[PDB]
């Protein structure tokens with residue numbers, strides 16, 4: 586049983602979307618996935634109602650739900666947590682019961698300062714350090730800032746995944762329909778997502 590948590594208070598960094606597709610990716614790899622929607626808006630939960638996610642969804646009404654994750658979904662292979670868009674007791678709660686903490690971040694001109702807040706909490710873990718990665722979400726080939734973000738990431742002392750999720754239309758249209766990119770035909774999207782999943786899987790050795 587391994588708990589993975591996508592955390593980042595600054596809403597708009599692609600938490601949900603990355604979670605939806607990555608969980609869907611892992612499911613196709615034979616892993617019994619379980620996702621926890623810790624966001625008040627219940628975005629991933631309202632989505633899960635549309636169709637039928639390739640994984641199970643749980644809505645963490647409060648912190649109590651997150652803390653118990655290790656005991657509630659202990660039968661699952663992975664417990665992918667969908668962080669909320671605010672620095673609540675949950676933001677830190679996720680870090681505690683997690684084995685890997687992904688930090689979704691999109692290249693913007695003024696908003697990489699919403700992301701370090703998580704990196705600080707990652708330190709609060711003295712023999713109890715939890716693995717962490719930097720996920721580059723919503724990528725556009727505007728060479729310039731992709732580099733600014735890329736560099737400011739190392740100032741944290743946290744390595745970022747080799748691959749990044751580009752800004753494609755399928756990622757938005759997938760949600761509208763009620764499913765993921767794996768239900769479409771955008772091989773370009775499926776590609777990067779899979780290559781990203783394996784990278785996450787390669788972590789647990």
Ligand SMILES: Nc1ncnc2c1ncn2[C@@H]1O[C@H](COP(=O)(O)OP(=O)(O)CP(=O)(O)O)[C@@H](O)[C@H]1O
Pocket residue numbers: 595596597598599600601602603624628629667668669670722723724750751752753754756757760
């Ligand atoms: N790879 C991608 N390509 C195109 N649009 C994307 C995208 N990833 C995310 N988006 C869009 O960006 C917006 C914010 O993404 P998302 O809803 O994942 O953010 P969050 O704000 O991280 C979600 P939540 O807090 O619900 O977990 C949405 O409008 C979404 O459709």
